[PDB]
Every structure is written in structure tokens, then in C-alpha cells.
Design a protein around this ligand. Structure first.
Ligand SMILES: Nc1nc2c(ncn2[C@@H]2O[C@H](COP(=O)(O)OP(=O)(O)OP(=O)(O)O)[C@@H](O)[C@H]2O)c(=O)[nH]1
Ligand SMILES: [Mg+2]
Lengths: 170, 876
């Protein structure tokens, strides 16, 4: 049992870092630009058997976009990740949502405000109102301090399977 | 080979296969655009092709016809316009014939229609698309898929294109939308597509919305569509209502009264999660727009003008029906519910907080009887709803009114901290934390502070979800008591305060909370460390032996972390070891700023030994090398001039940190360490100054460097110059040349991302020049021969600050640093700086702006610069 996930956002807001943190564990510090796309499977164990997410790590830069919207074919779940420390990463969230809904019909989308371990936040939690508008799920996340680093996958597993009584029995 | 094979290859999750397909598509696009686009259009229009290939070809045409960057989008549009008209005509014919042949629920060819239309319509080279779409939608013989695809294409066109192109023929577009949305449509999918198309086109039809009859027709059709038996159509119609109220709030006064209120109240009362969530979000959006209009009206009243838009207070008038419905929905829960589940209960709580912030004291009497009725309800759901409402109404009302209520309810909150229900305990701890945040004087009350502290230190042993808000309440209460301290004192620290009677017990319980094996859950260990750092930062001097014992415990824990380098076995043990390193180093940074100099003198040797061991463990490139640098910086700030003993051993690690530059945070931390070392050591950093200046020169140009790194480098250029005085003349010319090259560069002023970057860069340039002039001028004597080397650079410095003052964005820091630089140049050169300043009239305007500026330091520096200019004017 596995699903297909698309991880979108602006240029290196934390997507590759979050994927690497969840995959192996090590927090990569250098900013390495993603060349087109990265396919990294993530494994989780629940109380109803293990699952797998194929996280399509898309590129947030226009030069290295590659196929761009062509990675959204037959997507089953979506995570829109943006840097809290940069406001323009949040301002492009409706564009990524628009590109998601024009290729995906009825796919649940989870917002993720990444890198909240920084003491000063340019995008406050009050101002994040896009998840309210499109009935989306929002989590405050951080790949460095492990703040809610398993919550979005938990919500996506609960939504796709249909069992709210599902817990990561790690 | 065949294009269909590559188009189907574009979806496989293989890296080499995807790269080969992407390279083939890129080469085909570069080699010959028109034949490639014709082949793509012929592939898309074929119904016999697979769905994946058709959508891939459609997205290929779209992303070869448009892009997110507006300049690249315009370039691609002009490139499409450069194509011969026959190939474009064939592509348009195939794309238009593709509509209605798609069994896919989202239309793929509609994106192609929008992308082609956004280029063709401003040239008016395709004057057949709108009549074709109108005749397709309005034809009763049209199929469901054809109507859906045409409506979706209409919505995409109206969203993507500029509104000043189809303004003349938008009436037929809205007629088609209304015809496709009405109740007589048999298929629900067509209604859903029509509502989504209207949702996209709501920003396009503003000129049509200005007309009264069309606005009335749209409102009537949307209100009719809100009553659809299908759930998704109701959700889409409610979203349309939300966007209408967001965009057209000035025209809802005629329609919200008799029509919208009952529909939205019935949506709120619905047991369906989506419809109730949409109604709650409708009223939350009403509150958001009303508070934005209130902010606008306040700003207009500060300017002595009427506001552009006047709110009519819909939520304030509808509070009487909003509050009981919200509180009734607040009773909907389950025994297994997360905090940020975003159910209608969480939405109702957020909407209650928004209503409180929007309506101030008008929400208190409508929600107090619910609390008084259900504060002792036998069912835990109603007590949970009562305490959640009491927590939510804290922010926004005047705290003087809330003080007797929270004083009365404080014993009940203490009892509910020991409630058998887990959710009631969680919400009670959340309410206590919000009490300590918003109304701090209620928490520090001599009647109930001791049972409150006992309940808090017992809740530190409770579940991690409780203990997170318990420690957050502890930190906020420590801040509140510290601000409530210093009764007379007139000192830098209070002698004693309210938590001094149990500070040792509190810090012991926090240290035991750190060692909880379940501290990984709900970020309990990080929250406990943050609470410990906040309470040791906000502590009095009578608790100092407890601070010293805590520092010794942290040092011993760091030494235990030192002794487990060979204990690294798995990845998800060494990453927790790295997290412990970061937390313990931040804890050391927080506790070392509070300890005395003499007491930290004995522990500084062991601290430096620990940091040197961690640097030896992280000698190769990076590893962490971030928290340890600021730990060394805090140790330097503690010690001062006695740090020079360890400088010889610290030289290679600082050299590695300066040579690395692959991480912006690590380089920034090393740069700040260099600045703090210069401040602490004065002229004792000269033997290392040549090496660190060579490293800074190597990292100066270095075009693959993050934007925030360079201003810090200029700031420590100024710091090094000010620290070493006249010894900077060895590299003064090269530093001045590179600073001139950096200051000559300028970025765009349109996007606001680089506005703060250019402000910080200019502030750092002025700081660097200020430090150079202050170093070369000496400290107490008259003008020096060292500043005569920078004498021809005064003209360029004043030209650069004239160019800065020409820009009108500004901040306080740039004007303050400019005034300091002007004063230093005046004191260093006399009448020449005054004459060159008088040559540029914008400098006086910038100084007047700085005197106008509310920052005390900036105004003081501007006044000092003006005084120096006046003294130079009166000199001769
Ligand atoms: N404070 C903090 N910083 C983070 C965290 N995660 C990532 N960062 C920073 O953000 C950068 C992330 O880079 P990427 O994730 O690769 O950028 P991207 O969004 O994937 O886009 P690409 O450039 O295409 O790879 C890192 O270099 C880190 O410096 C975090 O959890 N906390
Ligand atoms: Mg990336």
C-alpha cells in the first residue's frame, strides 16, 4: 500500500531538507538546489499496517523547474511547504494551489509553514489564512527542531485511509 | 522516437528515465518550436490517446506558452506571436476541437485555451473564441463534458488574462456562467464547474459587478445555488460567497440582510463538516474584513480624512445569533481528537477568538451564561466547551472587565487542572497559559498564586500535552513577575520577586522535566529548555546560587555529551545528540549572560575545553559548527580581555569557519564571533588580524555567497578598523575599493524581498565607513594623518549617501548610520566635508527626515550631525 505525494513550494524553503530529515535523519545545512525533481520514498508504520509516501520533491526555482506542472499527473496527496522566514514563499502558495487543482480533482492538500525554529517569524501564525479559505489542513512544522515533523503525514494517512483512529506506532 | 512515449515517460518515478524525457522535451522545444507545438496540439486533440499523454501534452503547451515569471511569460507570448499564422491557426483549431472530448473530470485542454488566449486576445488575432464558447455553453444540445470543459476554460481565461482585454465582451461571458449555474441544469458537475468558473472570474468581472442588474442576477443565482442538494455545490457556492464578501463588501448591504443571513446561519447549523466549516469561515472572513476596515478607518482618522470604505459592522449586529451557534458547535468533540485537527470545533474556536478581537466587550455578556451554566456540567464536553470559550474570549475585551471573572473562576480552573478528563485538563492548561499571556496581573495575585504554582509544578509531571502549556505558562508567568519586579530598586536586576520563594523547586522540576523519557512527544524537551532559558533570563539576584547550580548541571550534561562521541551508533540517535548539543549550547548562552564575572572565571576553562573538544570533533568542514560559535561568542562577552589565552588554540577553527562559507548561518556566526573578539581584545587581535582579513578578502567578491552574508562582513570590516585603529592602512585601499564596488551595485526596488536586503547592505556600508573613519581618527586627539588616505573617498561616500537619500524607502538604521558617518567625516576633515555636504541638498533633507524619525538613537545622531554642520558653518 502506497500513495503519491507532491511537495511544492518556492526555491529551497525546506522541502529537500525536510525530505532528507525524514528519510535518513541527518539535518543537511548547505543549500543545494534541486535539479528538476527528486523521488524519495518515505516509510511509516501505523496501527493498520505500514504505508509509503512517494514524495515528489519538485524544484522551487524557475530556471531548474524542468517539467514543472507535469509532475502533478495522477497525484493523490499534496503538501504545500513554504518558509515562514520569507513572506514571498507564503505569497506564492495560492499559485501552487492553483497549479495543483487544475491537474488534480479532489485531492486533499496540507499546508506546512516550515522553519519556525527561527526566533523571528516574518509570517505570523495569525496571518496564515489560506488553509481556512480552501478547507485545507495546516500544521506549523520545522525540520530542524522536529516540531510536528510527523503530523502532516499522519493527517494525510488519516484522510486517505479514512480512519481518524490511526496512530504512528513507531 | 514517438512523442507519446516520452509524454507517458514523464510520469514514471525513475530519475534517469525522467531526466531523459525532460532532456528530449527541452531539445525538441529548443530545436524547432512550431513543429513541436503542432505535434503537441495534434496529440492533445486525439481522443484515442491515453489520458496521461493528453494531460502531459496540454501542460507542455501551457508551460511553453506561459510561466510564473512575468518577464519570461511576456517573452514566451512574444515568441508565440512570432510563429507563422498558419501553424498557430492549426494549433488553435486542434485545441478548440479538443474541448468536449475529455473523459477526465479536470479539463486538460482548457489550460491550453487560456494560455493561447492570453497571447492572442491582446493582439485580437483570434476573434472567434468567445462566441464559440458562448454558443457551446448556451446550446441546449451540448453534452455534460463539453459544457464543463467550456466553463472551465472560461474560468481559466478570466483568471489568467489581464482584465482590460475582455472588458467589452464580459457580459456574454457572465450570461453563459449564469446559464450554466442555474437550477434547471440537470447535472451537478456542470453546476460545480460553473461555480468554480465564477469563483475564478470574480476578480475579472469588477466592471460588470459595478452594474446593478448584473450584480443582482449574480447574487440571486449564487443564493439559489447555495440550496443545492449536492454537498460540493453548496461548498463551492459558500466559497463564492466568501470571495464575494472579500471583494465586494461595499455592495452587500442590500443583499446580506434579507438573503445571506439565513443561508449562512443554516450553513453554520449544519452537521456536515464542510458546510459548517464554510459558514464559520464566512463569518471569520467577515470579521477579518471588518477589522481590516477598522484599521483603515483608524489610519484615515489619524490623517484627518474619511476612510475609502466604511464598514457596517455585520458581525457586531449578528453577534446575538453568532455566539450561541458557535458555542453549541464548540461542544462537538471526540475522545481521540488532535489539537490542530481543524474540525468544525477548532474552526468555531478560531472564529470565537476572531469575533472577540473584532467586537471587544460586546462578546462577554453573550457568552458568560454558557460558562456559568456549564462550568460544572456532568458531561465533560460541556465543561470543555465552557473552558474553551473562556480561554477564547480572553483576547480582545478590556482586561479590567475580565479581571473579576478570572478571579472568580480561578479556583474552578485549579480544580479543573485535576479533572479526570484529559481533554478538560488540556484545555484548562491552555486557558491558564493564555491567562498568563494576555492578562498577566491575574496570574500574579497573592490570594491564589501559591495553589496555582503547586498545580503548575504538579502538571509538569502530567501528560506532555498538558506539560507543554504548563511550561509555556511558567515562562510567561516568569516574564510577568519579572516585569512586576523592581519595586523601587533602581538597579539592573531585581533583588527578589514573587517566584523567589520556590525558584529552586521550579528549576529542579524543570530539570527533571528535561530528563523525561517522553519529552520527545509534543516537543516537550524543547519547550522545557525554552522555559528554563526564559526563567533563568528573567530571574532575580537572590536566586543566583540556584542559577550557579543550574549552570553546573548544564556543564556536566554537556560533558556527558562530550564523553559519548563513540556512543554514536544509529542516525536517529546522533541527530538527537545534535539536537541536545544545540539545546545545551543555547542554554549555556542564556545562563552565562546572568552569571557573575568572577564565578564564571573558574568555569570558563572547562567551558573552553568542552568547546575545543566539540570543535575537534567537528574539525572537518561543518557537522554543526553553529551553536558552538555563538557559545564561544557568549563566553567572550563574559570574559573580555582575558580571552587571549585560548586565542592561539581558537585560531584554526575560526579560520575554518571563515574559509567554509557554504552555510550562511555558520559564516554569519563566525563573523559575529570575529566582531565580538575584536570588541573584547582591542589591539590584541593584530597578529590574527592579517589572516582573518585575508580570509575576508577571499570571501569578499565570492559571487556564490548568500545575500545576508555580505553586510555582516562589511559590519566586521568596520569593527576590525575601529578595534585596531591606525593599523588598518595595510589593507585600507583594498577594503575601500571592494566597498566602493559593492556600494556601486544596486538591485531592483520593485519587489519587497530585496528592499530589506538593500537597506541592510547600505546600513552596513555606512557602518563600515563609520568604523574606518573612527579607527583612523584615533580616540581623543585632533585629526590624524591616517584619515588623509580616505580623503578622496569622501566625495564618493557623500555621493553614495546622496544616492541613498534619493531612494525614498529608507529605515531608521540607515539614517542613523549616515548621520554617524557625517559626524565622523566632519570631525575628521573640517570645512571640506561641510562644503561637499552643502553641494548635495538631499543630505540636509535626509538629516531633517532623521530628526523627524521617532527612533531616539537616529534622532540623536541626526541632531549631532546637524550640530557638527552648524559648528563647521560657524567655524569660517
Ligand atoms: N532554521 C531552520 N532552517 C532551515 C530548516 N530547514 C531548512 N533550512 C534552511 O533552508 C535551506 C533549505 O534548502 P532546500 O530545502 O534544498 O531548498 P528547496 O526548497 O528544496 O528548493 P531547491 O533549491 O530547488 O532545492 C537549507 O539550506 C537551510 O539553511 C529548518 O528546519 N530550520
Ligand atoms: Mg529543492
Amino acid at each position: 500500500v502506497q500513495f503519491k505525494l507532491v511537495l511544492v513550494g518556492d526555491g529551497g524553503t525546506g522541502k529537500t531538507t525536510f525530505v532528507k530529515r525524514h528519510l535518513t535523519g541527518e539535518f543537511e545545512k548547505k543549500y543545494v538546489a534541486t535539479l528538476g525533481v527528486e523521488v524519495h520514498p518515505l516509510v511509516f508504520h501505523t496501527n493498520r499496517g505500514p504505508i509509503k509516501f512517494n514524495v515528489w520533491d519538485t524544484a522551487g526555482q524557475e530556471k531548474f523547474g524542468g517539467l514543472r506542472d507535469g509532475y502533478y499527473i495522477q497525484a493523490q496527496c499534496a503538501i504545500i511547504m513554504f518558509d515562514v522566514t520569507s513572506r514571498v514563499t507564503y505569497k506564492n502558495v495560492p499559485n501552487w494551489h492553483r497549479d495543483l487543482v487544475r491537474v488534480c480533482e479532489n485531492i486533499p492538500i496540507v499546508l506546512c509553514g516550515n522553519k519556525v525554529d527561527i526566533k523571528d517569524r516574518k509570517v505570523k501564525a495569525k496571518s496564515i489564512v489560506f488553509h481556512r479559505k480552501k478547507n485545507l489542513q495546516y500544521y506549523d512544522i520545522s525540520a530542524k527542531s522536529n516540531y510536528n515533523f510527523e503530523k502532516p503525514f499522519l493527517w494525510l494517512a488519516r484522510k486517505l485511509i479514512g480512519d481518524p483512529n490511526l496512530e504512528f506506532a513507531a | 522516437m514517438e512523442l507519446i512515449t516520452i509524454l507517458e515517460k514523464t510520469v514514471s518515478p525513475d530519475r534517469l528515465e525522467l531526466e531523459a524525457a525532460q532532456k528530449f522535451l527541452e531539445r525538441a522545444a529548443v530545436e524547432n518550436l512550431p513543429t513541436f507545438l503542432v505535434e503537441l496540439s495534434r496529440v492533445l486533440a486525439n481522443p484515442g490517446n491515453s489520458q496521461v499523454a493528453r494531460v502531459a501534452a496540454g501542460l507542455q503547451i501551457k508551460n511553453s506558452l506561459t510561466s510564473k515569471d512575468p518577464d519570461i511569460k511576456a517573452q514566451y507570448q512574444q515568441r508565440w506571436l512570432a510563429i507563422d499564422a498558419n501553424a498557430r491557426r492549426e494549433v488553435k483549431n486542434y485545441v478548440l476541437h479538443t474541448l468536449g472530448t475529455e473523459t477526465y473530470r479536470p479539463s486538460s485542454a482548457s489550460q491550453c485555451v487560456a494560455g493561447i488566449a492570453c497571447a492572442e486576445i491582446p493582439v485580437n488575432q483570434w476573434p472567434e473564441l468567445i462566441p464559440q464558447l458562448v454558443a457551446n455553453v448556451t446550446n441546449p444540445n451540448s453534452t455534460e463534458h463539453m459544457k464543463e470543459s467550456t466553463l472551465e476554460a472560461i474560468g481559466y481565461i478570466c483568471q489568467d488574462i489581464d482584465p482590460e482585454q475582455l472588458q467589452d465582451k464580459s457580459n456574454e461571458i457572465l450570461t453563459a456562467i449564469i446559464q450554466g449555474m442555474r437550477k434547471e441544469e440537470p447535472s451537478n458537475n456542470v453546476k460545480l464547474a460553473a461555480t468554480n468558473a465564477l469563483l475564478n472570474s470574480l476578480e475579472f468581472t469588477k466592471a460588470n459587478f459595478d452594474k446593478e442588474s448584473e450584480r443582482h442576477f449574480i447574487m440571486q443565482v449564487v443564493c439559489e445555488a447555495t440550496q443545492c442538494p449536492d454537498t460540493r455545490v453548496r461548498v463551492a457556492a459558500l466559497q463564492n460567497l466568501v470571495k464575494i464578501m472579500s471583494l465586494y463588501y461595499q455592495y452587500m448591504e442590500t443583499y446580506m440582510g434579507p438573503a445571506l443571513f439565513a443561508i449562512t446561519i443554516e450553513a453554520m447549523k449544519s452537521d456536515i463538516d464542510e458546510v459548517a466549516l464554510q459558514g464559520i469561515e464566512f463569518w471569520s472572513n467577515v470579521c477579518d474584513e471588518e477589522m481590516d476596515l477598522a484599521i483603515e478607518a483608524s489610519e484615515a482618522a489619524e490623517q484627518g480624512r474619511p476612510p475609502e470604505h466604511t464598514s457596517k459592522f455585520y458581525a457586531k449586529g449578528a453577534l446575538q445569533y453568532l455566539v450561541p451557534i458557535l458555542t453549541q458547535t464548540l461542544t462537538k468533540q471526540d475522545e481521540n481528537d488532535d489539537d490542530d485537527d481543524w474540525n468544525p470545533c477548532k474552526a468555531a474556536g478560531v472564529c470565537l477568538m476572531l469575533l472577540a478581537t473584532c467586537c471587544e466587550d460586546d462578546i462577554v455578556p453573550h457568552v458568560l451564561p454558557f460558562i456559568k451554566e456549564h462550568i460544572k456540567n456532568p458531561d465533560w464536553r460541556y465543561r470543555d466547551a465552557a473552558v474553551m470559550a473562556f480561554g477564547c474570549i480572553l483576547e480582545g475585551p478590556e482586561p479590567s472587565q475580565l479581571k473579576p471573572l478570572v478571579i472568580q473562576a480561578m479556583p474552578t480552573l485549579i480544580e479543573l487542572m485535576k479533572d479526570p478528563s484529559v481533554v478538560v485538563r488540556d484545555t484548562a492548561a491552555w486557558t491558564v497559559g493564555r491567562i498568563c499571556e494576555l492578562l498577566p496581573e491575574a496570574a500574579i495575585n497573592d490570594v491564589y498564586l501559591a495553589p496555582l504554582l503547586q498545580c503548575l509544578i504538579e502538571g509538569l509531571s502530567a501528560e506532555p500535552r498538558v506539560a507543554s502549556n504548563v511550561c509555556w505558562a511558567f515562562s510567561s508567568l516568569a516574564e510577568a513577575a519579572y516585569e512586576a519586579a523592581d519595586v523601587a530598586d533602581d538597579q539592573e536586576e531585581p533583588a527578589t520577586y514573587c517566584l523567589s520563594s520556590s525558584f529552586e523547586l521550579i528549576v529542579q522540576k524543570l530539570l527533571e522535566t528535561t530528563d523525561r523519557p517522553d519529552g520527545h512527544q509534543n516537543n516537550l524537551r524543547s519547550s522545557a529548555y525554552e522555559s528554563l532559558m526564559e526563567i533563568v533570563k528573567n530571574s532575580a539576584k537572590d536566586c543566583y546560587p540556584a542559577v550557579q547550580k543550574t549552570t553546573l548541571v548544564i556543564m556536566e550534561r554537556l560533558q556527558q555529551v562530550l564523553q559519548m562521541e563513540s556512543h554514536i551508533q544509529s542516525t536517529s540517535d546522533r541527530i538527537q545528540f545534535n539536537d541536545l548539543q544545540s539545546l545545551l549550547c543555547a542554554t549555556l548562552q542564556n545562563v552565562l549572560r546572568k552569571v557573575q564575572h568572577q564565578d564564571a572565571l573558574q568555569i570558563s576553562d572547562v567551558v573552553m575545553a568542552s568547546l575545543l573538544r566539540m570543535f575537534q570533533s567537528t574539525a572537518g568542514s561543518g557537522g554543526v559548527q553553529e551553536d558552538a560559535l555563538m557559545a564561544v561568542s557568549t563566553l567572550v562577552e563574559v570574559l573580555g580581555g582575558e580571552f587571549l589565552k585560548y586565542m592561539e588554540a581558537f585560531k584554526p577553527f575560526l579560520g575554518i569557519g571563515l574559509k567554509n562559507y557554504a552555510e550562511y548561518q555558520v559564516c554569519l556566526a563566525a563573523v559575529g564571533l570575529v566582531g565580538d573578539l575584536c570588541r573584547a581584545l582591542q589591539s590584541n587581535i593584530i597578529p590574527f588580524c592579517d589572516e582573518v582579513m585575508q580570509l575576508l578578502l577571499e570571501n569578499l567578491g565570492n559571487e556564490n555567497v548568500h545575500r545576508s552574508v555580505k553586510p555582516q562582513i562589511l559590519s566586521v570590516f568596520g569593527d576590525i578598523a575601529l578595534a585596531i585603529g591606525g593599523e588598518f592602512k595595510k589593507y585600507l585601499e583594498v577594503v575601500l575599493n571592494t566597498l566602493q564596488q559593492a556600494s556601486q551595485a544596486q538591485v531592483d526596488k520593485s519587489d519587497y524581498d530585496m528592499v530589506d536586503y538593500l537597506n541592510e547592505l547600505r546600513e552596513s556600508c555606512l557602518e563600515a565607513y563609520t568604523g574606518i573613519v573612527q579607527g583612523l581618527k584615533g580616540d581623543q586627539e585632533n585629526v590624524h594623518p591616517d584619515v588623509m588616505l580616505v580623503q578622496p573617498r569622501v566625495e564618493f561616500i557623500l555621493s553614495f549617501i546622496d544616492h541613498i537619500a534619493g531612494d525614498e524607502d529608507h529605515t531608521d538604521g540607515v539614517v542613523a548610520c549616515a548621520a554617524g558617518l557625517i559626524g565622523d567625516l566632519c570631525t575628521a576633515f573640517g570645512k571640506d566635508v561641510l562644503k561637499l555636504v552643502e553641494a548635495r541638498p538631499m543630505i540636509h533633507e535626509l538629516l531633517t527626515e532623521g530628526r523627524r524619525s521617532k527612533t531616539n538613537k537616529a534622532k540623536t545622531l541626526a541632531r549631532w550631525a546637524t550640530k557638527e554642520l552648524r559648528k563647521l558653518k560657524n567655524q569660517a
